[PDB]
Amino acid sequence: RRKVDTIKVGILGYGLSGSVFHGPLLDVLDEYQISKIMTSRTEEVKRDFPDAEVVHELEEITNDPAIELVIVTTPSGLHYEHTMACIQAGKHVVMEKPMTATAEEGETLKRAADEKGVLLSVYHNRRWDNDFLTIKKLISEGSLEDINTYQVSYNRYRPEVQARWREKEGTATGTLYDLGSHIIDQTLHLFGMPKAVTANVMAQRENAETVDYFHLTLDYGKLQAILYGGSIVPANGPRYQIHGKDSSFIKYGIDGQEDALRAGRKPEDDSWGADVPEFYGKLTTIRGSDKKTETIPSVNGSYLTYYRKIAESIREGAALPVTAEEGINVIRIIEAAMESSKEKRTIMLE
Amino acid sequence: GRRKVDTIKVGILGYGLSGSVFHGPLLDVLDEYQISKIMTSRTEEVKRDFPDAEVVHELEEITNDPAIELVIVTTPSGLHYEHTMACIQAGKHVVMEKPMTATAEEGETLKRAADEKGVLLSVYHNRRWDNDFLTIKKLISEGSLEDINTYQVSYNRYRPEVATGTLYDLGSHIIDQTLHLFGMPKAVTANVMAQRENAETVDYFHLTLDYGKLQAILYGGSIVPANGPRYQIHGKDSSFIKYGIDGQEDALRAGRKPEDDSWGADVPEFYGKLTTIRGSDKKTETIPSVNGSYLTYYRKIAESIREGAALPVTAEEGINVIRIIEAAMESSKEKRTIML
């Protein structure tokens, strides 16, 4: 039990994740101090964090006694090496998603972290998207009782195949890992693990080889969760269609916090994470013969909450906002989906 | 050879919902048809709607009548095979209510016998003349939906309280529309189940028809307070998204009959949205629906009988629908994809 200093943070990588999705959040929380960043982008780090030291080798973070938390935002195929070496040096770690290519590697990371007394969490921050927070509130207030169908669609319009290096390079490529993990994580958070996965996973784009289409069925008995996304979709349809015994929630659109971060905006006030009114979800409730329909203002998105929560886990022993086991379960779903599509059969989870 | 064209003399089997509401009123407005006979026990309802038709109780009274040319079979599911096979044996043309039969094997035999005797066999897949689907057909033919990669169709309802169940009953309409647009898929993956408490018949289905690059998703549940779009269609530069249901069956239930150009009109609020992308410009356009037109089905049958024209729906088309259903049922039971 000591003086509560700023948490001393090392960031690995300063590309998109590091510089747009993580750095700007940590910068507004004074729980944190960014001490070091492993990156070649020196001029970029100086502009954003005039007092952070830029370093170039992993050991400069890992072997620095002063650093307590490492954010791992480097390319997919370095995730495991970097995180493991952070764990071994006794640092707490936040990993970008997808956690790893396989459940087994995930298992191994979690085991090392518990052995070494350190905190390991995965940046599944779509639990704090405006739309999802809204679904959760609706659930907790009894407006979506006994869900029987849960359909989530994560479509994009990117019909053109990028460069080989961006397509093929590294572990865990494609939209199932990249986009699917968000909405799979949301599903596990709401419902726990299913009995079975059925899935079609493919590249629809001409000359694509890496995955650009997925359609997952998660079997929870009476409850069906259907998770899907294509890369040739000019307009999306609802992002969520949720049916309960008495009510439905249908909602379009995507959380706007990532766009605000890309634009140079920081969570500076209460208007952060606000949804756009024409994209508010519509709730339909049926009471006997009476059918009503009502537009729900979304709860504000709140990515800050993940890091405020991480600070509480580090400083006060609170439960982590996203655990290692939660991270792993998502990877389990993905591997079962990948095997389902290959074997052309339903894969039981054991 | 060619002779005087008087009315096609029709016999209707059954006079419940199908006969009295879905077929009789259509037939009644068309001068090409005359209803001579109806196998039913609802004498008084027939006397009311068709004052000049003779009512009958057993099937032989229609099948052994040389004057009867066409038989509309609107009896229950399990009676389809027997009644139709009897009509064929008697040299009558037949319109079968959907779903055709329970098994493809049963359908093939009806088809093979219809051909041997020399008569026309059709299945009443009138959802090809639903307003939304006609609107999709038009969009396709004018090239507004090129290179379809994803075709998602939902047919939900809210009935939380309880060839059976919804795959046969509802699924067949949208399976048929899919086959009409795309032909036969390579494979069918499906979950087909009973979601309601104490349910004993299929009330939920989720089908994937695999066409390669193209994926067709056909689904429906029975505990759905609000629907979501009925059609989501995506192609290389455009999507079409539409809500709502064709309102012809409702106008028929209300006792209205096709009489002016306003039959089958959609409600503007449910017109589809067509979205098109040109580089960075995203453009969205509300598409007024083509008027639904169930009459077209019987005008077509008339021309087939009188003029040798192609049937509006062929026996083979109906059998293919059943093939998909049997395949979905097997997929669901076996927990695997079924190759066709």
Give a written overview of the molecule.
The first copy, chain A, is α/β, with parallel strands linked by helices and 350 residues long. Chain A has 2 domains: 5-124 and 303-319, NAD(P)-binding Rossmann-like Domain (Rossmann fold); 125-302 and 320-350, Dihydrodipicolinate Reductase, domain 2 (2-Layer Sandwich), CATH 3.30.360.10. In chain A, 34% of the residues lie in helices and 23% in strands. Chain A has 11 helices and 15 strands. Chain A has helices spanning 16-28, 42-48, 59-62, 79-88, 103-116, 130-140, 164-168, 175-191, 257-262, 304-316, 324-343, and strands at residues 7-12, 32-38, 53-55, 69-72, 92-95, 120-122, 149-153, 196-202, 213-220, 223-229, 240-243, 247-251, 281-287, 290-296, 347-348. In chain A, strands 14-13-12-11-7-10-9-8-15 form a 9-stranded mixed beta sheet. In chain A, a hairpin with a 2-residue loop joins strand 13 (281-287) and strand 14. In chain A, helix 4 packs parallel to helix 5. The longest helix of chain A has 20 residues, at 324-343. The radius of gyration of chain A is 21 Å and the shape is globular. The termini of chain A are far apart. The interface between A and B is large, with 42 and 41 residues. Chain A: This is scyllo-inositol 2-dehydrogenase (NADP(+)) IolW. Chain A: Belongs to the Gfo/Idh/MocA family. Chain A: InterPro entries: Gfo/Idh/MocA-like_OxRdtase_C (IPR004104), Gfo/Idh/MocA-like_OxRdtase_N (IPR000683), Gfo/Idh/MocA_oxidoreduct (IPR051317), NAD(P)-bd_dom_sf (IPR036291). Chain A: Keywords: NADP, Oxidoreductase. Chain A: It catalyses: scyllo-inositol + NADP(+) = scyllo-inosose + NADPH + H(+).
